[model samples]
Target chain A: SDAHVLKSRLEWGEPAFTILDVRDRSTYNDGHIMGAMAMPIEDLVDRASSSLEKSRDIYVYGAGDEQTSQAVNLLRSAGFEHVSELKGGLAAWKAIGGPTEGIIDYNVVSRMQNHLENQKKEVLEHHH
Target chain B: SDAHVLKSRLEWGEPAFTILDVRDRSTYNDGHIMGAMAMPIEDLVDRASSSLEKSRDIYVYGAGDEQTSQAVNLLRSAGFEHVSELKGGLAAWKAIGGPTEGIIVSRMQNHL
Candidate 1:
């Protein structure tokens, strides 16, 4: 899966899946792809089993591949049927203009409509 | 000026402009946003004036802000009326899955 994979799902209002981030609280607070719930490593499966459904669509991430796989394995072992990994980091999420929270820093790409406005004000005027 | 600014232009078939990169040959070869032409700072203006039209929509970038601005200003003085800076680095371009040439490093974020 790619950033756009998750992005398209959100755009289509596919709300069945829950996203998980097994990162530190500080990093999660700094920023995370929107709607992600933190599932700490200490009791990730424990907390997940406490509330998450066995058949719920669960998309997950961690600080790295090693940590991420371990969490997903635990979930599979715990009887989750629809478990899958959500690809990309905070940086990748922003690239697709994905909605995010906390430190949502990315430049606004100028829409094409505005370019015509600027051109009329400056470029076309230069000839006159 | 953002990466997507250039990106959407390409997607929408706005074929009126050329993208210039003033970064080094090695780095440019390693990776560059697709359709970007190398306009090395050594002869950036000379090469630009040699063929690129003053009327053409020219989106440009360089090694950093200093070089970027310098190229834009020079283009403006050289009678190009529609000059603008292409913002974001190669990394930023790839972030949005922008089309790239050379290394095309899209694997960093993907794993099976």
Candidate 2:
């Protein structure tokens, strides 16, 4: 599906659908479309059965366009009828300035800068 | 204040408050109470002011007992009036079966 269309739906704001990141957990944690669940493709069917309704609209994306298609087919075969492949995946969503959430984006650089300043001060005080 | 007390509020479930994990990002990424935002004490004041209302009920926790007190005080001093220290932090929450979310936990589940 199109990123613009998906984002427009999000902006409309009832959260009627779910976005699934059919990728590794590390990839999901480092960066992902905001609010997408980490399904890892391997367990997508199992996790979906347990946590989400099959009829619920789901937008699935993965590391590769080919992989994304595989996951979409996998879900369809597993009875998830409403699933769609999110083309261009994370890049597509990001190119449109879609919101994202991840630890790397959240605090990594700020924390490093803070530590650097503190270390510099500690060294200066020691010299004094 | 207490683990169960904070969890009870979560169970009641209107999201009327925020849970801040003031430990460093490395520690927070390993584990944290579900929905807790990473706000290492060094950046807590600024992050809070921009992201949360001063009147928002905030539960703060950190790696050390003393560290938590400082975070709570920092928020309070910065005009975040409803800030409170969450005693025992992650350990307390995990001991009582509170739900948690983290990179480690998510990966662990994927492997299982």
Candidate 3:
């Protein structure tokens, strides 16, 4: 899903969904969506079967759309009814300030908030 | 991808991508990802095929994971190669302060 709608749903407190990162383990370790579990394409369906329910809402993404589709197709064909491929992969989510994590990354809101706060502080100082 | 990584990529100033919000018209109008286009689940492939390139990066989300996956699948089957489903839908995005818009909603950062 697009970052905006996802953010809105979370803000509205609507629960019940899952995000799957189907990229390779190394790529996923570099960074991934917050709360998204690592389910490398190679072992996706098998891992999913053990952890997820067919009725649960599932969102999947990967190194690119191709891999995502592959994983999604596998899930759907396997009878895991609710699965979606996030268009644009991770790049799109980053553009709109979605959260991500890894050994090297950080949160978007915090950075934006810092900028916002700094801008505000500057304005207040100027006013004073 | 998870909402978190997406934000990081953008912050890194890596441009060149698109976000597709695949919820219904009314729900989309109520609120959607800031840069996301409203391509409701029903008309996903048709609209996406006409406007998007198979290679263009596309991140899609909707009312829930189910809808998001459906839209993503439609785009993939249609041959648009770069689509991804945003996990947790809008809810995950909101948890981390991603931008959004709708008739009844305001921005999270604005409140902060």
Candidate 4:
């Protein structure tokens, strides 16, 4: 509820809040949200100390609902009091007609249409 | 510094410390720190609220040095008490002889 990034983005625009991508090295390069930095859920705590000021609004997003939820817990445990996750992760963003910029086209949404259908469940026809 | 997962993992063995991935969806999928989860930095705040307990040792890692730093800043700014980052991210890990998992190949460390 409080660790969703998409919700924050919708609440106060992009520049207003900080976006953190907590996936991993490979996944990060594959294709993350625009202007999103790769912090992999593992090393989030350490990086947080070095970069953030411990007093800014933070937003976290992922691919699916489940993955992002796991990340939220990591931050909360570490002491991120004002954290939030993007609803449905990237799946929901795309569902809401969100346009992606740089896509790895291999790891994350590799199949593009197939990933959207199976992973994200996007509306598509068997005509292309 | 203190939140480095590699150090924690080596110190206490497996299943000891909590690994946090702060990359995006594609980066997470392509590959990530072992036993790490995908929070896509963007969704970390909310995901942290639901998954973690607000009182655990957390480590964050990513691809390059700068990228991961940004995510770390987000967490700290959001009130994360104990937070730190991997010195050189995946690149440094590799330099230090770290084993990677589920590599995406085409992105991130494609050349290396």
Candidate 5:
């Protein structure tokens, strides 16, 4: 499925299924689809087998379409019956403004709030 | 530092340290300190060694105080010069309103 379909479903509160980020841990930590689990391609099968059921729906992506397809094939070979490669991966997700979280991005909201608070303080002190 | 100190530092924009949730993966996915990396006790040393420098300040917690202490010791033994236990674990963190993130916690903001 495309990123818009997945984003729409998330917005509609459709629960169940998992979003797997098949990139390496550092990349996953840098920025990933929010709520997507960091299941690197190497550790994918072992981690998924322990945590997810065979029939569970999974939407997976990686750094590129080729990588995503590779992960999907791996899951299918492992007997995961309901796996789909998310077309266009993270770039598509970001193009549509799907939520992303990471070390720098995660602090964006707090940083903005701090800036606003400081501005308000400066304005008040100047008025005194 | 305890959860409060850590919380305070985070609020004040300190950015040099790492927070480690040394609990099981499932438990960590359920909830953990916001930005805390899920490095379970089983994979603590190896994961930390690869991701963090030995002198990096790290605050760790787990299922209990004992678990937190165990993780701290393991990190210290591995030459992580600046590791501290988050006193009272997640419960204490929750009491002080420290930010937390996880599968459920991550979604709550969006739903709101």
Candidate 6:
């Protein structure tokens, strides 16, 4: 949903938007988007005025879709405009094979899943 | 340290290795590496019997480096070999500009 829009911006090198990663301290340490500012949702609301500029297009994401939306809503209630969520979460973003800057081992799972799915197709082909 | 090794595999498209995300369910939902199985560190050890076979290159990663290392250690203790920790955690991985396939929203912290 919103992810497609984000991809468009990256594709065009749009500098108007700012990607705010709103996960936990440990999560942020593990990995995140390149140039993405790690601002936990809790702190984002707690220190919005100081940590962020009100004029920028802020994109919030977290460990799940619902939480990301809630963070966006929270920011909105706190008077934040021009905010969006990176839909389908990071998994969806990774599925598209988008460019990312991180050393998380999570990518292995996705690759395995893709391979398993592909093999499933082959096995089913023989069976069917 | 471990992150660098992972980069080489990705760069080479090496097919033997597998990355296991040790975060929780919600974390997996938000985002994860594309092929990463959402095996929380808690569960990786929990379902080590039926969920996975004994053979495989199991690379573990999480929000921070310590936890990931612990998971790797746990897997090793639980009798899983070829297990390694993704160094620098996910943050370092992202820093290297590698190809990650997931939707985790947690990669935003540190340098406080």
- Candidate 5, residues B13-95, lDDT tens digits: the string is 54567789999877876677766778889989998998799988899999998899999999999999999998898889778
Backbone clashes in model 5, listed as residue pairs: none
What is model 2's DockQ versus the real complex?
0.04
lDDT of 6 at B110: 14
Superposition TM-score, candidate 4 onto the true structure = 0.39
| lDDT against the true structure, each candidate | 0.66, 0.74, 0.68, 0.56, 0.75, 0.64
> Could you give candidate 5's per-residue lDDT for residues A16-111 as a string of tens digits?
567889997768766788767777899889877766777777899998989999999999999999999899998898888776766323453354
Two-chain complex of model 3, DockQ on C-alpha atoms against the true structure = 0.04
Off by over 4 Å in 4: A1-128, B2-16, B103-112
Alpha-carbon runs more than 4 Å astray in model 3? A1-128, B103-112
TM-score of 6: 0.43
* Model 1: per-residue Cα lDDT over A1-128, one tens digit each: 46677776676544666777777755764556665665666767876776566777777887776777788888999898988765655666778676554321112211321232223222233223
Note the DockQ of each predicted structure.
0.04, 0.04, 0.04, 0.02, 0.03, 0.04
All candidates in order of lDDT, best leading: 5, 2, 3, 1, 6, 4
Error of 2 at A113 (Å): 33
Scored by TM against the true chain B, the candidates give 0.83, 0.88, 0.84, 0.71, 0.88, 0.76
Which portions of model 2 miss their true places by more than 4 Å? Answer: A1-34, A37-58, A61-84, A87-128, B104-112
Local accuracy of candidate 4 as per-residue lDDT tens digits, B29-74: 5655544556777678777767665555567776666767877787
Q: Largest lDDT belongs to which candidate?
A: 5
Residue B43 Cα positional deviation in candidate 3, in Å, after optimal superposition: 1.0
TM-score of chain A of each: 0.72, 0.78, 0.75, 0.63, 0.78, 0.72
What order do you get sorting by TM-score, best first?
2, 5, 6, 3, 1, 4
Q: Candidate 1 at B45: error in angstroms?
A: 0.8
Q: What is the TM-score of each candidate against the true structure?
A: 0.42, 0.52, 0.43, 0.39, 0.49, 0.43
Candidate 6 residue-wise lDDT, B56-90, digit = tens: 77778888877787788888888877887777766
RMSD of each: 16.0, 15.0, 20.7, 17.2, 17.0, 16.6
Better of 4 and 6 by lDDT: 6
Best of the candidates, TM-score: 2
